[PDB]
Design an enzyme around this catalytic site. Structure first.
Site, PDB file in Angstrom:
ATOM      1  N   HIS A 127      -3.596 -14.062   8.889  1.00 52.76           N
ATOM      2  CA  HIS A 127      -2.655 -13.033   9.384  1.00 52.76           C
ATOM      3  C   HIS A 127      -3.294 -11.664   9.116  1.00 52.76           C
ATOM      4  CE1 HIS A 127       0.631 -10.232   9.647  1.00 52.76           C
ATOM      5  NE2 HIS A 127       1.185 -11.124  10.495  1.00 52.76           N
ATOM      6  N   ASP A 131      -2.356  -8.627   8.327  1.00 60.20           N
ATOM      7  CA  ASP A 131      -1.946  -7.850   7.128  1.00 60.20           C
ATOM      8  C   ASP A 131      -2.514  -8.540   5.896  1.00 60.20           C
ATOM      9  OD1 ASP A 131      -0.402  -5.855   8.483  1.00 60.20           O
ATOM     10  OD2 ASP A 131       1.317  -7.237   8.425  1.00 60.20           O
ATOM     11  N   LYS A 132      -2.505  -9.877   5.876  1.00 63.12           N
ATOM     12  CA  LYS A 132      -3.072 -10.610   4.723  1.00 63.12           C
ATOM     13  C   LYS A 132      -4.585 -10.537   4.654  1.00 63.12           C
ATOM     14  CE  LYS A 132      -0.037 -11.714   1.749  1.00 63.12           C
ATOM     15  NZ  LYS A 132      -0.794 -10.895   0.776  1.00 63.12           N
ATOM     16  N   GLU A 144      -7.512   0.667   0.377  1.00 60.86           N
ATOM     17  CA  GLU A 144      -6.711   0.264   1.559  1.00 60.86           C
ATOM     18  C   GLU A 144      -7.670  -0.260   2.623  1.00 60.86           C
ATOM     19  OE1 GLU A 144      -3.847   0.207   0.661  1.00 60.86           O
ATOM     20  OE2 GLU A 144      -3.173   2.046  -0.328  1.00 60.86           O
ATOM     21  N   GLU A 192      -9.707   5.489  -2.623  1.00 65.71           N
ATOM     22  CA  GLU A 192     -10.267   6.253  -3.766  1.00 65.71           C
ATOM     23  C   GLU A 192     -10.780   5.233  -4.764  1.00 65.71           C
ATOM     24  OE1 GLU A 192      -6.678   6.748  -3.154  1.00 65.71           O
ATOM     25  OE2 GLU A 192      -7.329   7.903  -1.434  1.00 65.71           O
ATOM     26  N   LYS A 203       2.003 -18.127  10.424  1.00 65.15           N
ATOM     27  CA  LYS A 203       3.253 -17.634   9.820  1.00 65.15           C
ATOM     28  C   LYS A 203       4.146 -18.840   9.611  1.00 65.15           C
ATOM     29  CE  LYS A 203       4.661 -13.463  10.904  1.00 65.15           C
ATOM     30  NZ  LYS A 203       5.231 -12.308  11.642  1.00 65.15           N
ATOM     31  N   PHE A 259      -0.800 -19.976  21.059  1.00 63.62           N
ATOM     32  CA  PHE A 259      -1.259 -19.006  20.037  1.00 63.62           C
ATOM     33  C   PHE A 259      -2.781 -19.175  19.878  1.00 63.62           C
ATOM     34  CE2 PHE A 259       0.144 -17.773  15.349  1.00 63.62           C
ATOM     35  CZ  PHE A 259      -0.705 -16.684  15.359  1.00 63.62           C
ATOM     36  N   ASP A 275      -2.963  -8.351  16.531  1.00 59.03           N
ATOM     37  CA  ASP A 275      -2.113  -7.292  15.936  1.00 59.03           C
ATOM     38  C   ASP A 275      -2.904  -6.539  14.857  1.00 59.03           C
ATOM     39  OD1 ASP A 275       0.533  -6.633  16.878  1.00 59.03           O
ATOM     40  OD2 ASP A 275       1.223  -8.679  16.383  1.00 59.03           O
ATOM     41  N   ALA A 276      -2.796  -5.219  14.824  1.00 57.89           N
ATOM     42  CA  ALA A 276      -3.317  -4.384  13.720  1.00 57.89           C
ATOM     43  C   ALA A 276      -2.748  -4.843  12.393  1.00 57.89           C
ATOM     44  CB  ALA A 276      -3.025  -2.941  14.041  1.00 57.89           C
ATOM     45  N   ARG A 292       1.452  -4.615   3.589  1.00 55.46           N
ATOM     46  CA  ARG A 292       2.497  -4.752   4.632  1.00 55.46           C
ATOM     47  C   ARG A 292       3.135  -6.149   4.556  1.00 55.46           C
ATOM     48  NH1 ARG A 292       2.620  -0.863   8.958  1.00 55.46           N
ATOM     49  NH2 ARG A 292       3.772  -2.621   9.870  1.00 55.46           N
ATOM     50  N   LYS A 293       2.909  -6.859   3.474  1.00 58.44           N
ATOM     51  CA  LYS A 293       3.514  -8.178   3.201  1.00 58.44           C
ATOM     52  C   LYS A 293       4.054  -8.208   1.769  1.00 58.44           C
ATOM     53  CE  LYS A 293       3.344 -10.087   7.195  1.00 58.44           C
ATOM     54  NZ  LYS A 293       3.687  -8.731   7.670  1.00 58.44           N
ATOM     55  N   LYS A 336      -5.612  -2.435  -5.947  1.00 53.15           N
ATOM     56  CA  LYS A 336      -5.252  -1.519  -7.047  1.00 53.15           C
ATOM     57  C   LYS A 336      -5.675  -2.115  -8.387  1.00 53.15           C
ATOM     58  CE  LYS A 336      -1.195   0.252  -4.595  1.00 53.15           C
ATOM     59  NZ  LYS A 336       0.251   0.469  -4.750  1.00 53.15           N
ATOM     60  N   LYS A 387      -2.536   1.211 -11.922  1.00 54.38           N
ATOM     61  CA  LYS A 387      -1.478   1.349 -10.889  1.00 54.38           C
ATOM     62  C   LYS A 387      -0.307   0.445 -11.305  1.00 54.38           C
ATOM     63  CE  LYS A 387      -5.091   3.292  -8.696  1.00 54.38           C
ATOM     64  NZ  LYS A 387      -6.268   3.702  -9.478  1.00 54.38           N
ATOM     65  N   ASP A 395       2.468  -0.070  -9.966  1.00 48.45           N
ATOM     66  CA  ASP A 395       2.996  -0.864  -8.826  1.00 48.45           C
ATOM     67  C   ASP A 395       2.597  -2.319  -9.008  1.00 48.45           C
ATOM     68  OD1 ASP A 395       4.244   1.141  -7.248  1.00 48.45           O
ATOM     69  OD2 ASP A 395       2.428   1.427  -6.053  1.00 48.45           O
TER      70      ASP A 395
HETATM   71  C1  LIG Z   1      -0.725   9.155  -7.716  1.00 49.88           C
HETATM   72  S1  LIG Z   1      -1.260   8.727  -6.056  1.00 49.88           S
HETATM   73  C2  LIG Z   1      -1.642   6.947  -6.226  1.00 49.88           C
HETATM   74  C3  LIG Z   1      -2.900   6.641  -7.006  1.00 49.88           C
HETATM   75  C4  LIG Z   1      -4.189   7.097  -6.309  1.00 49.88           C
HETATM   76  N1  LIG Z   1      -4.413   6.333  -5.029  1.00 49.88           N
HETATM   77  C5  LIG Z   1      -5.383   6.930  -7.259  1.00 49.88           C
HETATM   78  O1  LIG Z   1      -6.542   6.893  -6.783  1.00 49.88           O
HETATM   79  O2  LIG Z   1      -5.248   6.852  -8.506  1.00 49.88           O
HETATM   80  C6  LIG Z   1       0.263   8.383  -5.126  1.00 49.88           C
HETATM   81  C7  LIG Z   1       1.020   9.617  -4.715  1.00 49.88           C
HETATM   82  O3  LIG Z   1       1.228  10.415  -5.895  1.00 49.88           O
HETATM   83  C8  LIG Z   1       1.190  11.787  -5.542  1.00 49.88           C
HETATM   84  N2  LIG Z   1       0.131  12.473  -6.277  1.00 49.88           N
HETATM   85  C9  LIG Z   1      -1.161  12.706  -5.869  1.00 49.88           C
HETATM   86  N3  LIG Z   1      -1.855  13.418  -6.723  1.00 49.88           N
HETATM   87  C10 LIG Z   1      -0.962  13.702  -7.745  1.00 49.88           C
HETATM   88  C11 LIG Z   1      -1.106  14.427  -8.949  1.00 49.88           C
HETATM   89  N4  LIG Z   1      -2.221  15.076  -9.297  1.00 49.88           N
HETATM   90  N5  LIG Z   1      -0.020  14.508  -9.753  1.00 49.88           N
HETATM   91  C12 LIG Z   1       1.106  13.885  -9.367  1.00 49.88           C
HETATM   92  N6  LIG Z   1       1.350  13.157  -8.273  1.00 49.88           N
HETATM   93  C13 LIG Z   1       0.261  13.108  -7.489  1.00 49.88           C
HETATM   94  C14 LIG Z   1       1.036  11.864  -4.026  1.00 49.88           C
HETATM   95  O4  LIG Z   1       2.308  11.983  -3.427  1.00 49.88           O
HETATM   96  C15 LIG Z   1       0.326  10.543  -3.721  1.00 49.88           C
HETATM   97  O5  LIG Z   1       0.539  10.071  -2.399  1.00 49.88           O
HETATM   98 MG   LIG Z   2      -1.821   5.716  -0.643  1.00 51.45          MG
END
Ligand SMILES: C[S@@+](CC[C@H](N)C(=O)[O-])C[C@H]1O[C@@H](n2cnc3c(N)ncnc32)[C@H](O)[C@@H]1O
Ligand SMILES: [Mg+2]
Ligand SMILES: O=c1nc(N2CC[C@@H](F)C2)c2ccc(Cl)cc2n1-c1ccccc1
Ligand SMILES: O=c1nc(N2CC[C@@H](F)C2)c2ccc(Cl)cc2n1-c1ccccc1
Ligand SMILES: [Cl-]
Lengths: 388, 371
Positions: A22, A24-25, A50, A63, A174, A243, A251-252, A257-258, A278, A282, A284
């Site tokens: 898929h 997205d996967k 990403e 990043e 799916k 299919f 599909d993009a 997105r999952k 991540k 992170k 999340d």
């Molecule tokens: C903190 S960044 C996520 C982590 C990032 N991709 C990394 O490389 O570590 C997620 C969101 O936090 C916010 N953000 C970015 N720079 C920030 C900073 N210096 N201090 C606080 N929030 C920040 C922005 O809205 C950004 O889209």
């Molecule tokens: Mg981002």
């Protein structure tokens, strides 16, 4: 009178899963292949990778700050080969696809606010956000039956594709499973599978009736315990028919997105953060894994039959802002009492979670298909013995 | 005793994921303006200097993607390299595959599950946590655009923790426990001036004073420096704020993103219909809070399942509520489109500050129920 008791006493719930092909996967798996490549060389790599997938293209954007030397062309193409896209007949080929890289360093403003010049134990959350963990005693893996079966149907398709028993199969799939449940005082008891959907990419040769027969006999009956399947179970197998066009051509796809497929199939709750690509800073990812660990510990410890945990953070702050518990009425203890047991047993600072769950290890590509939760040999799936 | 915390977050119009949602829905609206039957699946990716459009379109519309993207970025406020992003000079790459081209019986375009939620804790039938989080981002944009806080930049995040009580499953907000605000800023303003302004001019202008007290915890500019922001700071993608878009973690989510999808995508249309159902049940006095699940198979018109969870806030059983839903609503995708008037180019308005709880969307007008 039995029909009246069934209508009143039962309910349906539906969860979906998708296969490795898929689009997205694909992105999730490539993002985690990149993360694992970095962590193999630099356990402290800061990764926010990403992936975007469309006809003929993988793009990496995000990043990374890392001492690793990573060959992104090789990592991406090897991941696409593993998934099984190796020919233009399948709509995508690792040998000849476009790979574009737009990867920069982590923001220095983020680095200085989160981790620079701190002991690892004092590292701030890498962002703000909310995260949830969920567990249910309805399965041995402490997961909803709907999402367990949906994931296992995609795993079975990939298994029979890769061992050549169903060689007409292609990587994009799916699945969707509707279970009819009853409740026991807030705990849920699966009775039967009500509806199964399977849609899977295939080659040009096989007929619709042959595919439908194989999906019932070799996939569904090899995955779903027979007691859940009956004369009334509804099967939607290749429901939209042909299919052949699939994967990124169809599909993009994007990373993250999952996120409901990745977690509890719509049960429990979700704070919105993606996992794939991540590193452990992170929250999340790391705090969702820790909250799963907490929830599973509470259920296997016999405190709850089902439970949901919320945790939240601010960027640059180590200690969680809030912790919350919802036991669905399945505990002799109050939610207040359960939250005290959590705060006595667990420390959900990201710098401590990384030690407790060994999150510098390059195991993340394994998580990027078939769900992050309910599987063998992940540290967040080993319940903590609780004291209280 | 009986109290608990819950946390929701929101992001501003210049958050990189939200930039993508807004651009994807600007593209959708541009198509629907010319071709009301346009099929659109437009994904947007934003990173340093780059907007990429990817996906599939079947439309009679002739759309100027350079103009649509640049006008959306201008409106958000990224108009100079000093802010990290400029609509005038950024790269716009288009990878869209476009094709030339009874409604009630049309099959769902995909499988999937969708939920709708409503709660009587606010007039808008939304959780207070997500309402306040959104309104804090809207206030930042307001004070940025009117020049009262000219050091503000477009990229922002907010987070609101509310302390609640319960009344037999209904949730009752007591006080704001914690507020986070992180907002991109210029290099001239001091941290003490920004933190003072965020408390006095933003938070106290948005949060009712009754919910703020001397124990409320403030995390304002908690990173200490946020000059680098927008897509330069963090890659944005369409459909990566789906919980900000909905209920702030309350209710439930089926996983489908909304932005860049036309009304034939059940990820969008059935989530909007499920919201309409849940709101109709609460405003109809049947529940104080309710969650509705619906699911589909590709090529099938009738939902595979419909489910109700009333959180113990109804005198009626979930089975009786489900019968009232089935008697009052037709959740076939072709019928949802007709009942909610979804062929209109109204979608870019949805792509920041949440899809639910706001004025003048058809899914926010409760249906009078017959039962
Ligand atoms: C903190 S960044 C996520 C982590 C990032 N991709 C990394 O490389 O570590 C997620 C969101 O936090 C916010 N953000 C970015 N720079 C920030 C900073 N210096 N201090 C606080 N929030 C920040 C922005 O809205 C950004 O889209
Ligand atoms: Mg981002
Ligand atoms: O946990 C859950 N339990 C259900 N039960 C039915 C009564 C008892 F059997 C339990 C239920 C049923 C329908 C729906 Cl639409 C959601 C449900 N949820 C749920 C709630 C919040 C978020 C995600 C799922
Ligand atoms: O709806 C909800 N109500 C809570 N209440 C506490 C008891 C009564 F006051 C209600 C609650 C509290 C904590 C958490 Cl972590 C989730 C909760 N959820 C919830 C459940 C499923 C999914 C998303 C949120
Ligand atoms: Cl974010």
């Amino acid at each position: 009178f039995h029909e009246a008791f069934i209508e009143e006493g039962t309910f349906l719930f539906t969860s979906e899963s998708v296969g490795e092909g898929h689009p997205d996967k694909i992105c999730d798996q490539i993002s985690d292949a990149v993360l694992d490549a970095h962590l193999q060389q630099d356990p402290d790599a800061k990764v926010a990778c990403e992936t975007v997938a469309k006809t003929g293209m993988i793009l990496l954007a995000g990043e990374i700050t890392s001492r690793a030397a990573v060959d992104y062309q090789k990592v991406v193409r090897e991941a696409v080969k593993h998934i099984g896209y190796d020919d233009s007949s399948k709509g995508f080929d690792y040998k000849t696809c476009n790979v574009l890289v737009a990867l920069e360093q982590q923001s220095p403003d983020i680095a200085q606010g989160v981790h620079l010049d701190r002991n690892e134990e004092d590292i701030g959350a890498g962002d703000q956000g909310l995260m949830f963990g969920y567990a249910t005693d309805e399965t041995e893996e402490c997961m909803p039956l709907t999402i367990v079966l949906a994931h296992k149907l995609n795993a079975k398709l990939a298994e029979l594709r890769r061992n050549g028993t169903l060689p007409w199969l292609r990587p994009d799939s799916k699945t969707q499973v509707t279970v009819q449940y009853m409740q026991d005082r807030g705990a849920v008891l699966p009775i039967r599978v009500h509806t199964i959907v399977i849609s899977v990419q295939h080659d040009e040769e096989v007929c619709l009736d042959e595919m439908r027969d194989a999906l019932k006999e070799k996939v569904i009956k090899a995955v779903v315990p027979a007691k859940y399947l009956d004369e009334d179970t509804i099967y939607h197998l290749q429901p939209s028919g042909r299919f052949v066009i699939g994967g990124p051509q169809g599909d993009a796809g994007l990373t993250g997105r999952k996120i409901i497929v990745d977690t509890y199939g719509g049960w429990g709750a979700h704070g919105g953060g993606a996992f794939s690509g991540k590193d452990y800073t992170k929250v999340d990812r790391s705090a969702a894994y820790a909250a799963r660990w907490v929830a599973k510990s509470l259920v296997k410890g016999g405190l709850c039959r089902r439970v949901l945990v919320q945790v939240s953070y601010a960027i640059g702050v180590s200690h969680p802002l809030s912790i919350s518990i919802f036991h669905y009425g399945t505990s002799q203890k109050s939610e207040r009492e359960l939250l005290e047991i959590v705060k006595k047993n667990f420390d959900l600072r990201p710098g401590v979670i990384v030690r407790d769950l060994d999150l510098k290890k390059p195991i993340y590509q394994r998580t990027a298909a078939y769900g992050h939760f309910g599987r063998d040999s992940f540290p967040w799936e080993v319940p903590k013995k609780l004291k209280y």
